[PDB]
Write a protein that binds this ligand. Structure first.
Ligand SMILES: NC(=[NH2+])NCCCO
Ligand SMILES: O[B-](O)(O)O
Ligand SMILES: [Ca+2]
Ligand SMILES: [Mg+2]
Ligand SMILES: [Mg+2]
Ligand code: NA
Length: 223
């Protein structure tokens, strides 16, 4: 997260870190047994780390649970990044408490201008590289359809939204991929793609979760 602030510890209790040896992606706990992330995060083996604040220190509230199943959306396209969504079934249920909690799926899509919260352990620098120990947070609004599609001509499908700023400086970045965009209590976005991070007129593009509630629920019921 570039241009954000450090979240209060465990204040994003649905945020997870996906670990393959090191943190590589975010995700969101939506069911006791299921995390949703981005398809471009796929790895064949993933440990899900719940309850984290400092991903470099064991602070006690963590739950480390290996993935049992990893299911990318059948229509993910790695070029266009359409359908950039993946589900991870936990090998045992997460234990839900104040620091580990589910986040609701969307009841509707979000209006333009809706305020959201984006979080992750990704790169914090707009030039160079710094990967934080502590979870970072950013407040950002859902952008207008004209602001989003003008920024990426021909590239915004109906399964994508832009959230962020057209001025440079405030965005998600590498290592935030797969993490949440929560607006009014609902997971509306998954950190997906853009052009670099926090550059002017290149806001973050996010998987539009309100189009995927049926796919999510059907995958959970079947597995
Ligand atoms: N603004 C961004 N480029 N965010 C997405 C992080 C890399 O997929
Ligand atoms: O969201 B508008 O006005 O494109
Ligand atoms: Ca920790
Ligand atoms: Mg140590
Ligand atoms: Mg480090
Ligand atoms: Na432009």
């Amino acid at each position: 997260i570039v241009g954000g602030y450090t979240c209060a510890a465990n204040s994003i209790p649905y945020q997870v870190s996906l670990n393959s040896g090191s943190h590589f992606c975010g995700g969101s706990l939506i069911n006791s047994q299921w995390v949703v992330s981005a398809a471009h995060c796929y790895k064949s083996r993933i440990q899900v780390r719940l309850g984290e604040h400092n991903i470099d220190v064991l602070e006690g509230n963590e739950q480390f649970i290996n993935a049992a199943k990893i299911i990318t959306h059948p229509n993910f396209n790695g070029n266009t990044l359409d359908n950039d969504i993946m589900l991870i079934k936990l090998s045992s249920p997460a234990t839900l408490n104040s620091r580990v909690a589910t986040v609701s799926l969307p009841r509707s899509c979000a209006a333009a201008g809706t305020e959201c919260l984006i979080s992750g352990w990704g790169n914090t620098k707009s030039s160079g590289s710094s990967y934080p120990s502590l979870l970072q947070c950013l407040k950002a609004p859902v952008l207008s359809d004209s602001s989003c599609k003008s920024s990426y001509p021909g590239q915004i499908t109906g399964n994508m939204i832009c959230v962020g700023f057209l001025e440079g400086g405030k965005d998600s970045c590498q290592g935030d991929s797969g993490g949440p965009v929560v607006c009014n209590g609902q997971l509306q976005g998954i950190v997906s793609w853009g052009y670099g991070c926090a550059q002017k007129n290149k806001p973050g593009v996010y998987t539009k979760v309100c189009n995927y509630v049926n796919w999510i629920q059907q995958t959970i019921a079947a597995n």
